[PDB]
Structure formats: structure tokens, C-alpha cells
């Protein structure tokens, strides 16, 4: 519906279209005449679409008069038989005819049914719409499409990127760890925690001297754990979560990276993120410390008993709730039955 003449279809063409969707005809010629779309010459199928085409179509093509030609292929689709819609508009015609036949094309196409047309050919010469020309139209579909230089650079990026995707690297999916020396005090405190002598070790980084030191080891229970996490500075925590899981009691250690917010300089919260990989390496590899969870909180108040339990032993996936459909057609009269069709 773009700049349509408004020329609709004569009822005769409505009838002949209804019959053509029963596979009745090989060919419908549609012309415009006195403000109406009307049939010209219809033909019945004789041989194959291959052999009909050149003798059925070409002599219906006037030198300087546009027309529409619907040609029934021997293919099929869901709606039924499949058609070629050819638009004949020789460019030497009178512009009135060119205008009408271009500005009623979409209206006729919709009138016939878009589902039944699989190819639309626009020809200005006989070579465009002869059988050879239709074959070449199909071949032109089998042709590669023109891409820009940027469009192809992006495809090159895509294919090498897909190689990277399936690769097994892992090392260059992170920036390599930063190894700050751990202090003897801090190391010894981590050791005493691993042997269940303490239940809390708080580590802090000397940013200037680039070493990680021991800040705290105070006796910490689950209720006092929130009071251990500062509000102004980032810190590392090792804590002995004593809890009860599914009937048996566990003393298990949790690592907590506490980072309060923009109270920390980019330098501070950068170093704290960069040293974690290597610190936990030293803890788990050298001391054989079994760390069951690594938590990253920004406020100490987050650490409720329910929070620690939910982070360590997680619940099942909560399935999505759904609202109910409309009531449907009222007084429908009928058990639902399958619409199956052999």
C-alpha cells in the first residue's frame, strides 16, 4: 500500500484467481483497462513448466505495453502450487502506462495472495523474462552478495574470533597475578587458623611498601563477624564458619574480600583485586587450606547467618512464576480435540 492507483480487481479476476489457486491454469495475463484490473489471456497447463514457459509467455509480451504475467510452476508449497509473478514494463512505453502498471503491482500481488508467489521478476526486455532469463534470476540468487570493505573486515574478525572462542587458553583470560610478599606474622596467623587454633584472620595490604600484612586475629563468632568488616578500607578475611548442614556439623573456612566503595582509592581497590589470585594460591597450595567459599561483600552488615549459609550451601533454582491465560471463548461447546491431519 504505497502510492497505489486504487485500481482494484474486476470480479472476473477474483473468480479466475480462486480457480487458479486450484492449480487450474498455467498462465494468467493481467492488464489494466478503464480503471480496472482485468484478465487478458489465460492458458491451461499442457506439458512441464519448463517446456510451457518460452511458448506460453514470450508472445504475450507486447513491445511497448506493460502487463502482469502469473506463471504456475510445477513446484508446490503449503498454500498450494507456487507461482512466478513477472512484471513486464518495457521502458519505451508511454509513461502513463508505466505509472499505472507500477502503482498497481503491489495491489494486484496482495489480491492474488503473497504466499503463492515465490519469485517476482521485473523485466524491461525479452531477455530479462525469457526462460533463460528466469534461470539466470535463480542463478543470481545463487550469487554472492556485495559487501563493503568494513562489512568484510568485520567478518574476518568474526571468524578468527570464533577460533579464539573454541580455544583452550584460560591464562590470557585474566591479567597475570600480582605477588605481594606475605608477612611472617600474617603467614603464621593463617597457619594457626588452618590448624583450628584461631577462628578469624584479617589481612591488610601495605600499599606503599607493597607487602600484605596481618591486621587482626580477634576471636570472631558468627554474630560478631559484621563488626569485623571496616566501613572505610578494603580487607581480606579468613573466617571459621561453624555451621550445621543437613544434619552434620561443619567447621569450614570462608574467604571474604571486603571492599566498601569509593572510600577506597582506585589504587587501593585495584591492588586488592590484583593480589587476591596470588594470596589464595599461597593459602591453598602452600598451607593446604580448604576454602569452601570466596565471598565479595561491600558492607559487613551483609553477613547474616542466612547470608553465609546461602553463599556456602546454595538452594535449588527457583522456577519462574507464571500468570494465567484469558478465560477463552465463553460457552465454547466442545471438548478440545487435536487438529491433526494425515
Amino acid at each position: 500500500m504505497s502510492h497505489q492507483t486504487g485500481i482494484q480487481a474486476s470480479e472476473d479476476v477474483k473468480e479466475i484467481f480462486a480457480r487458479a489457486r486450484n492449480g487450474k491454469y498455467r498462465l494468467l495475463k493481467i492488464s489494466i483497462e478503464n480503471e480496472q484490473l482485468v484478465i487478458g489471456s489465460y492458458s491451461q497447463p499442457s506439458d512441464s513448466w519448463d517446456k510451457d514457459y518460452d511458448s506460453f509467455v514470450l508472445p504475450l509480451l507486447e513491445d511497448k505495453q506493460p502487463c502482469y504475467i502469473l506463471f504456475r510452476l510445477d513446484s508446490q508449497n503449503a498454500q498450494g502450487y507456487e507461482w512466478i509473478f513477472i512484471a513486464w514494463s518495457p521502458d519505451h512505453s508511454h509513461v502513463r502506462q508505466k505509472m499505472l502498471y507500477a502503482a498497481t503491482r503491489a495491489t494486484l500481488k496482495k489480491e492474488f495472495g503473497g504466499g503463492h508467489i515465490k519469485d517476482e521478476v521485473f523485466g524491461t526486455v525479452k531477455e530479462d523474462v525469457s526462460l533463460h532469463g528466469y534461470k539466470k534470476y535463480l542463478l543470481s540468487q545463487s550469487s554472492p552478495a556485495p559487501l563493503t570493505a568494513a562489512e568484510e573486515e568485520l567478518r574476518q574478525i568474526k571468524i578468527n574470533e570464533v577460533q579464539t572462542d573454541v580455544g583452550v587458553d584460560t591464562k590470557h583470560q585474566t591479567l597475570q597475578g600480582v605477588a605481594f610478599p606475605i608477612s611472617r606474622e600474617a603467614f603464621q596467623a593463617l597457619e594457626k587458623l588452618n590448624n583450628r587454633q584461631l577462628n578469624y584472620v584479617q589481612l591488610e595490604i601495605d600499599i606503599k611498601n607493597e607487602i600484605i600484612i596481618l591486621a587482626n586475629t580477634t576471636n570472631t563468632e558468627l554474630k560478631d563477624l559484621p563488626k569485623r568488616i571496616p566501613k572505610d578500607s578494603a580487607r581480606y578475611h579468613f573466617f571459621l564458619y561453624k555451621h550445621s548442614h543437613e544434619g552434620d556439623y561443619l567447621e569450614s573456612i570462608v574467604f571474604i574480600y571486603s571492599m566498601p566503595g569509593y572510600t577506597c582509592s582506585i589504587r587501593e581497590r585495584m591492588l586488592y583485586s590484583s593480589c587476591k589470585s596470588r594470596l589464595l594460591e599461597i593459602v591453598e597450595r602452600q598451607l593446604q587450606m580448604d576454602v569452601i567459599r570466596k565471598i565479595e561483600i561491600d558492607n559487613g552488615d551483609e553477613l547474616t547467618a542466612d547470608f553465609l549459609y546461602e553463599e556456602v550451601h546454595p538452594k535449588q533454582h527457583a522456577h519462574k512464576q507464571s500468570f494465567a491465560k484469558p478465560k477463552g471463548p465463553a460457552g465454547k461447546r466442545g471438548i478440545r480435540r487435536l487438529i491433526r491431519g494425515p
Binding site: K158, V162, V166, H317, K320
Partner: protein, 269 residues
């Protein structure tokens, strides 16, 4: 509503169970029939066929590696064959468990070819499969000596809601100076987080191998297997792209040709 047709309905459901989901659809059909004896009687061969079609790997006690359950390993009485260690075992299909391992002599006298192929193939599987198993059979079918290499690989992540299996079968016959190599590769992926999506794929390969002695022919055969399987997998990964931008585009557009989301007030007049 014949009960004899009810069991073949139940059996059809089972043979179409996705890899790693056998127990689930089984429990489903069992609660739908609620005729446990009718199901056990009338669907036994369906269980056996599902296990032999999915290359179920099973571990026998005291034996390194696992063994694939295939139609080629069938021995009757619900007993199968492990050709690598030259035994055989009772195998329970429902629970997929291995019992009663007893040594069993196999005649036909082509051990060296099977052993060469099994060494080479099980070396190849370690190079190209994270969780792969392989079983190599040697037979004389229609009086000619045939090697059948089977490869299985799979990942079952029911918590993440996806399972995936890879089956590979490669047959070639010992006939000098050349022999025909047939292969069939199958991939099945089920992803059912908040919907149901499946990938089913298969590919048949025909190639030609040149047979001489065990050491050389097994090498060339493994090279055929390797290159053909790599080609299949690479083509699948590229096919995902071609479908995403071109094949899918046929069914529905990402945007209409105008590249503009259509204005609804404009149409409604």
C-alpha cells in the same frame, strides 16, 4: 487402546529419550502406564536398543577404561563383550550396571589388527575428547575381516539443564591393496532451561584407505578418522553462523527490509 499398543507407545517414547535423560522419561512413562510388569515385559528390547544406540559407556570392576555398549558387542542373555580385555559381562540396561565378568574366548584369529587399531584409536580419543571412550571390535562378517571403531563422548549437566552426546562409528575391512572406509558421526544436544531446544545432527563419510600391515594401515585409518571428524565439527561451528544470519533469516527477519520497526498508528487507517 490396546495394551500391546500402549507398550509400543511407551517404548517409542523411551528410544527417543535425550542423552542423559533416560531415567527421567522412563519414570514418566512408568507413572503413565502404572503397569510396571506390562512395561518391563513389553519394553525390555526398547531399553536394550536405547543402550546400544547411544553407545552407553560402562565400567567393569578392576578394569581401567570403560567399555561401550553397542550392537557389535551384543552376545545374548543381556550379556555384552569387552574386546580389549577379552572378557564378557552381564549388563543391566535399566540401571546400566556391569556384573559377572568372565573371560571368554573369541575365535576368528585377527588379534594384531584389533590391538593396533585399539591402541591408535584410544590414543587419538585422548587428544580430541575431554570425556571420550572408545571400543574397537574385529569381526569376520560375510567371511571378510572388518574393524569397527566406536567413539563416544558426552557431558551431562542436569543442574544447568543441558546434556550432550557424540557418537562416532568407523568401519573398514582388511583387504589388500586397498579398502573402503565408512563412517557415521552423530551429535545430540538438549538444552531445556526455560524452554526446549535440541540439536540433532549426523554425517556419513566415505573414504578409501590403503592397507598393507597393521602398523601403517592403522596410522592411515586414524588419519582418515581425525581429518574427517575435525572437518565435520568445524563445519558445524561455521553452520551455526550461516544459520543465525541467513537460514533463520528466511523464517523471520530480525528487522524488515526498511531497517525500521514498523509504525502501528500509520497502518491503522
Amino acid at each position: 487402546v490396546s495394551d500391546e499398543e500402549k507398550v509400543r507407545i511407551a517404548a517409542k517414547f523411551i528410544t527417543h529419550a535425550p542423552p542423559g535423560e533416560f531415567n527421567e522419561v522412563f519414570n514418566d512413562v512408568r507413572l503413565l502406564l502404572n503397569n510396571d510388569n506390562l512395561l518391563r515385559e513389553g519394553a525390555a528390547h526398547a531399553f536394550a536398543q536405547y543402550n546400544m544406540d547411544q553407545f552407553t559407556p560402562v565400567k567393569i570392576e578392576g578394569y581401567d577404561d570403560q567399555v561401550l555398549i553397542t550392537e557389535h558387542g551384543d552376545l545374548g542373555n543381556s550379556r555384552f563383550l569387552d574386546p580389549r580385555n577379552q572378557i564378557s559381562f552381564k549388563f543391566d540396561h535399566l540401571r546400566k550396571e556391569a556384573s559377572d565378568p568372565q573371560p571368554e574366548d573369541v575365535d576368528g584369529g585377527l588379534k594384531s589388527w584389533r590391538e593396533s587399531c585399539d591402541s591408535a584409536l584410544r590414543a587419538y580419543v585422548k587428544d580430541h575428547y575431554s570425556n571420550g571412550f572408545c571400543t574397537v571390535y574385529a569381526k569376520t562378517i560375510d567371511g571378510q575381516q572388518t574393524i569397527i571403531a566406536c567413539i563416544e563422548s558426552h557431558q551431562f549437566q542436569p543442574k544447568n539443564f543441558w546434556n550432550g552426546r557424540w557418537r562416532s562409528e568407523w568401519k573398514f575391512t582388511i583387504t589388500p591393496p586397498s579398502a573402503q572406509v565408512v563412517g557415521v558421526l552423530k551429535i545430540q544436544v538438549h538444552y531445556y532451561e526455560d524452554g526446549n531446544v535440541q540439536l540433532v545432527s549426523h554425517k556419513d563419510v566415505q573414504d578409501s584407505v590403503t592397507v598393507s600391515n597393521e602398523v601403517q594401515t592403522t596410522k592411515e585409518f586414524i588419519k582418515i578418522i581425525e581429518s574427517a571428524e575435525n572437518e565435520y565439527q568445524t563445519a558445524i561451528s561455521e553452520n551455526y553462523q550461516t544459520m543465525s544470519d541467513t537460514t533463520f533469516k528466511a523464517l523471520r527477519r530480525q528487522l524488515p527490509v526498511t531497517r525500521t520497526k514498523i509504525d502501528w498508528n500509520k497502518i491503522l487507517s
